[PDB]
Enzyme design. Structure first.
Site, PDB file in Angstrom:
ATOM      1  N   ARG A   1      14.091  -6.915  15.836  1.00 22.65           N
ATOM      2  CA  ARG A   1      14.968  -7.896  15.209  1.00 22.65           C
ATOM      3  C   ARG A   1      14.513  -9.346  15.404  1.00 22.65           C
ATOM      4  NH1 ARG A   1      15.769  -4.451  11.899  1.00 22.65           N
ATOM      5  NH2 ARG A   1      17.165  -2.703  12.430  1.00 22.65           N
TER       6      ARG A   1
ATOM      7  N   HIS B   1       0.248  -5.514   2.347  1.00 22.40           N
ATOM      8  CA  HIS B   1       1.038  -4.832   3.364  1.00 22.40           C
ATOM      9  C   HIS B   1       2.449  -5.417   3.429  1.00 22.40           C
ATOM     10  CE1 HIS B   1      -2.696  -2.999   5.051  1.00 22.40           C
ATOM     11  NE2 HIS B   1      -3.227  -4.084   4.508  1.00 22.40           N
ATOM     12  N   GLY B   2       3.404  -4.626   3.923  1.00 24.88           N
ATOM     13  CA  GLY B   2       4.781  -5.066   4.094  1.00 24.88           C
ATOM     14  C   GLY B   2       4.949  -6.444   4.724  1.00 24.88           C
TER      15      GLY B   2
ATOM     16  N   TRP C   1      -0.913   7.432   9.077  1.00 29.85           N
ATOM     17  CA  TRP C   1      -0.147   7.088  10.275  1.00 29.85           C
ATOM     18  C   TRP C   1       1.330   6.782   9.998  1.00 29.85           C
ATOM     19  CZ3 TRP C   1      -2.920   4.065  14.788  1.00 29.85           C
ATOM     20  CH2 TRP C   1      -4.049   4.797  15.195  1.00 29.85           C
ATOM     21  N   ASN C   2       1.654   6.288   8.800  1.00 28.94           N
ATOM     22  CA  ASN C   2       3.064   6.144   8.416  1.00 28.94           C
ATOM     23  C   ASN C   2       3.727   7.514   8.576  1.00 28.94           C
ATOM     24  OD1 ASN C   2       2.499   3.758   5.662  1.00 28.94           O
ATOM     25  ND2 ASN C   2       2.846   3.380   7.851  1.00 28.94           N
TER      26      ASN C   2
ATOM     27  N   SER D   1       0.087   1.292  13.119  1.00 27.02           N
ATOM     28  CA  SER D   1      -1.308   1.039  12.760  1.00 27.02           C
ATOM     29  C   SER D   1      -1.715  -0.412  13.017  1.00 27.02           C
ATOM     30  CB  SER D   1      -1.586   1.393  11.297  1.00 27.02           C
ATOM     31  OG  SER D   1      -1.524   2.786  11.079  1.00 27.02           O
TER      32      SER D   1
ATOM     33  N   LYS E   1       6.719   6.219  17.800  1.00 26.45           N
ATOM     34  CA  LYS E   1       7.949   5.574  18.179  1.00 26.45           C
ATOM     35  C   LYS E   1       8.529   6.181  19.451  1.00 26.45           C
ATOM     36  CE  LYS E   1      10.941   7.980  15.174  1.00 26.45           C
ATOM     37  NZ  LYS E   1      12.330   8.196  14.936  1.00 26.45           N
TER      38      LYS E   1
ATOM     39  N   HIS F   1       0.850  -1.174   0.000  1.00 24.29           N
ATOM     40  CA  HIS F   1       0.000   0.000   0.000  1.00 24.29           C
ATOM     41  C   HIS F   1       0.895   1.235   0.000  1.00 24.29           C
ATOM     42  CE1 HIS F   1       1.023   1.164   4.067  1.00 24.29           C
ATOM     43  NE2 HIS F   1       0.999  -0.195   4.373  1.00 24.29           N
TER      44      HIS F   1
ATOM     45  N   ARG G   1      -6.083   1.103   3.318  1.00 31.14           N
ATOM     46  CA  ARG G   1      -4.850   1.591   2.710  1.00 31.14           C
ATOM     47  C   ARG G   1      -4.421   0.678   1.562  1.00 31.14           C
ATOM     48  NH1 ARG G   1      -3.666   0.101   8.021  1.00 31.14           N
ATOM     49  NH2 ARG G   1      -1.828  -1.176   8.521  1.00 31.14           N
TER      50      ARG G   1
ATOM     51  N   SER H   1       0.573   5.726   4.401  1.00 32.89           N
ATOM     52  CA  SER H   1      -0.685   5.995   5.095  1.00 32.89           C
ATOM     53  C   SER H   1      -0.570   7.237   5.974  1.00 32.89           C
ATOM     54  CB  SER H   1      -1.091   4.804   5.968  1.00 32.89           C
ATOM     55  OG  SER H   1      -0.425   4.853   7.222  1.00 32.89           O
TER      56      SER H   1
HETATM   57  O1  LIG Z   1       9.849  -0.367  16.427  1.00 30.48           O
HETATM   58  C1  LIG Z   1       9.805  -1.139  15.490  1.00 30.48           C
HETATM   59  C2  LIG Z   1       9.202  -2.427  15.668  1.00 30.48           C
HETATM   60  C3  LIG Z   1       8.664  -2.793  16.933  1.00 30.48           C
HETATM   61  C4  LIG Z   1       8.082  -4.044  17.111  1.00 30.48           C
HETATM   62  C5  LIG Z   1       8.027  -4.945  16.048  1.00 30.48           C
HETATM   63  C6  LIG Z   1       8.554  -4.588  14.810  1.00 30.48           C
HETATM   64  C7  LIG Z   1       9.147  -3.307  14.622  1.00 30.48           C
HETATM   65  C8  LIG Z   1       9.686  -2.945  13.346  1.00 30.48           C
HETATM   66  O2  LIG Z   1       9.628  -3.742  12.426  1.00 30.48           O
HETATM   67  C9  LIG Z   1      10.290  -1.649  13.162  1.00 30.48           C
HETATM   68  C10 LIG Z   1      10.345  -0.767  14.218  1.00 30.48           C
HETATM   69  C11 LIG Z   1      10.939   0.518  14.051  1.00 30.48           C
HETATM   70  C12 LIG Z   1      11.474   0.903  12.819  1.00 30.48           C
HETATM   71  N1  LIG Z   1      12.045   2.210  12.691  1.00 30.48           N
HETATM   72  S1  LIG Z   1      11.265   3.532  13.327  1.00 30.48           S
HETATM   73  O3  LIG Z   1      11.651   3.744  14.698  1.00 30.48           O
HETATM   74  O4  LIG Z   1      11.740   4.765  12.733  1.00 30.48           O
HETATM   75  C13 LIG Z   1       9.485   3.388  13.236  1.00 30.48           C
HETATM   76  C14 LIG Z   1       8.794   3.646  12.053  1.00 30.48           C
HETATM   77  C15 LIG Z   1       7.407   3.526  12.000  1.00 30.48           C
HETATM   78  C16 LIG Z   1       6.690   3.149  13.128  1.00 30.48           C
HETATM   79  C17 LIG Z   1       7.369   2.894  14.308  1.00 30.48           C
HETATM   80  C18 LIG Z   1       8.755   3.011  14.367  1.00 30.48           C
HETATM   81  O5  LIG Z   1       9.409   2.745  15.590  1.00 30.48           O
HETATM   82  C19 LIG Z   1      11.418  -0.001  11.735  1.00 30.48           C
HETATM   83  O6  LIG Z   1      11.943   0.336  10.473  1.00 30.48           O
HETATM   84  C20 LIG Z   1      10.837  -1.261  11.897  1.00 30.48           C
HETATM   85  O7  LIG Z   1      10.802  -2.137  10.790  1.00 30.48           O
END
Ligand SMILES: O=C1c2ccccc2C(=O)c2c1cc(NS(=O)(=O)c1ccccc1O)c(O)c2O
Ligand SMILES: [Cl-]
Lengths: 240, 233
Positions: A116, A185-186, A15-16, A22, A99, A10, A61, A13
Site C-alpha cells: 500500500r 509493464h504494470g 512467473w505470474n 519477477s 507470495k 505484457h 515478456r 508471464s
Molecule cells: O505483495 C505484494 C507487493 C509487495 C511489495 C510491493 C508491492 C506489492 C504489490 O503491489 C502486490 C503484492 C501482492 C498482491 N497480491 S498477491 O499476494 O496475490 C501476489 C501476486 C503476485 C505476486 C506476489 C503476490 O504477493 C498484489 O496484487 C500486489 O499488487
C-alpha cells in the site's frame, strides 16, 4: 480526437503463474500470456488501428507481447525502440520469491505496508541474492550509471526513471503526430497513466492494469486525456 | 578483429521465392521459419553475442531476425529496419513464375533481364495484382518520389543499400558494436560485393545460402581477414 495513444501491459508471464516476483528478472510469457497478447492484437486489428512507432522495455515478456501484436496487426515493419526505463519495477530482495515465501519471511503486516506504499522500497537485492548476477551483471544494463542501476525500487522510484523517457522520447513523437504504441509493464505504465490523468499517489496504487489488453487514450493538444481510458477486446474480456 | 554476421531469410509462403517475391511482403513458410530456428540455434551453440541488429522492412526478413534473437536470448537488442535492405523490386515480374514471365514479356527480354547486372525489369502496370499493394504501402511513405523504386536492376538495389551500410552500419562496427544483419539475397549481395571487392559477374554468380549465419572477420579497415564462414553442424 486530437491524438491517439495505445498502451498494453505484457501478457501473463510464466512467473505470474507461479506468483513469483519477477521485477527485472526476464521471465517469458506463458502460453496463456501469449494468447492474451494475440487476442489484444486481433482486437486492435478489427478496429483498424495503425501505428507509426513502438516503445517497449528490455524485458522479453513485454517485447514478445509487442511482437505478437505487430504480427496480428500486420505492422512488423514498424520502428521499435527498447528502453530499460520502461522495465517493470525492481523488486529488490523479493525478486524470485513467491507470495508464500514472502509472507513467511517478512510477515503479512510488512507485506501490506509495501503493498500500500507509494514510496517505501522493498529490501535491496544484495550480492548474495540468487538473482544478483542474473540481473545486475546482465550486459543489457552495462551502459547504466552506478546511480541508475537499482538494487530495489519503490513505485515512486520506478515512475521517476520512467517519466524522463516519456518526456524526452515519446512526447516528441506524439506532438509530431506519430501514432504511438507502448508495450510495457504494470508499474511503468502506471507512471504514464498517473502523469496523464494527474492521479493521486493513493489512486495510482489502486489502478490495476490487466495483462495483454490494449488501453486507448485520446489526448488534447496539451496531451491531456479528453475522455477516460478505454479497454479493447471482445465484450467478455472487456467487461471483466 | 571485428566480427560481422549476416543471415539470409529462407523460404517464403506460396513458393514466392521462385515467383520474384521482391517487394511483395510475403511471410516465411513454416519450412522457412524452421530454417531460421536452426540458424539461431547455431548462433546460440557458438555463444555469439550482438549489440545491434539491422534488417529490411519486409516481414520475411524481420521474422527471421525475431526467430534468431529469440533463439539466442537477445530479444532486448536494438533493432533497426530499413527499406534499403529490401530485396530487389522486381516490378511487373513480381508474383510471376518463370513460364508466366516468358509468356508475358517474351523470351528476348526475359533472357536479357536474367543475365543483366544493370538492366531493370519493367515496372508494374496499373492492373498488376500487386500494384497498389506495394506502391501505396505506407511503410514507404517517407520516400522521395525519386527514391521510390518501381523496378530495380541488381545494380540499382546494390546502389541504394550501400549508402545505408556506409552511413548507418559502418559507424556501429568502428565503435566495436557487434552487428547482426538479417536480410535478403540481393541486398546481402550488395554488402558482400563491397566487402570482398567482387566484380559484377562474380556477384551474380554468388548465391548466398539461406537460414545460415555467415560470419566475417574484419580488419581495422573493414576488410575481410578470411573468406566468409558458415556456422552449423
Ligand atoms: O505483495 C505484494 C507487493 C509487495 C511489495 C510491493 C508491492 C506489492 C504489490 O503491489 C502486490 C503484492 C501482492 C498482491 N497480491 S498477491 O499476494 O496475490 C501476489 C501476486 C503476485 C505476486 C506476489 C503476490 O504477493 C498484489 O496484487 C500486489 O499488487
Ligand atoms: Cl523488434
Amino acid at each position: 480526437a486530437a491524438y491517439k495513444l495505445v498502451l498494453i501491459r505484457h501478457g501473463e508471464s510464466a512467473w505470474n503463474l507461479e506468483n513469483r516476483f519477477s521485477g527485472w528478472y526476464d521471465a517469458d510469457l506463458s502460453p496463456a500470456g501469449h494468447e492474451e497478447a494475440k487476442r489484444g492484437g486481433q482486437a486492435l486489428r478489427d478496429a483498424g488501428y495503425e501505428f507509426d512507432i513502438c516503445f517497449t522495455s528490455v524485458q522479453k515478456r513485454a517485447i514478445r507481447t509487442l511482437w505478437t501484436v505487430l504480427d496480428a496487426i500486420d505492422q512488423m515493419w514498424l520502428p521499435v525502440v527498447r528502453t530499460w526505463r520502461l522495465n517493470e519495477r525492481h523488486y529488490g530482495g523479493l525478486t524470485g520469491l513467491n507470495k508464500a515465501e514472502t509472507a513467511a519471511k517478512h510477515g503479512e503486516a510488512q507485506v501490506k505496508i509495501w503493498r500500500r506504499s507509494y514510496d517505501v522500497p522493498p529490501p535491496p537485492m544484495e550480492p548474495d541474492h540468487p538473482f544478483y548476477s542474473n540481473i545486475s551483471k546482465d550486459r543489457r544494463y552495462a551502459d547504466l550509471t552506478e546511480d541508475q542501476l537499482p538494487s530495489c525500487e519503490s513505485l515512486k522510484d520506478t515512475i521517476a526513471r520512467a517519466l524522463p523517457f516519456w518526456n524526452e522520447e515519446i512526447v516528441p513523437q506524439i506532438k509530431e503526430g506519430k501514432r504511438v504504441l507502448i508495450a510495457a509493464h504494470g508499474n511503468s505504465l502506471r507512471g504514464i497513466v498517473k502523469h496523464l490523468e494527474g492521479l493521486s499517489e493513493e489512486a495510482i496504487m489502486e489502478l490495476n492494469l490487466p495483462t495483454g489488453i490494449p488501453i486507448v487514450y485520446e489526448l488534447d493538444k496539451n496531451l491531456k486525456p479528453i475522455k477516460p481510458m478505454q479497454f479493447l477486446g471482445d465484450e467478455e474480456t472487456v467487461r471483466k
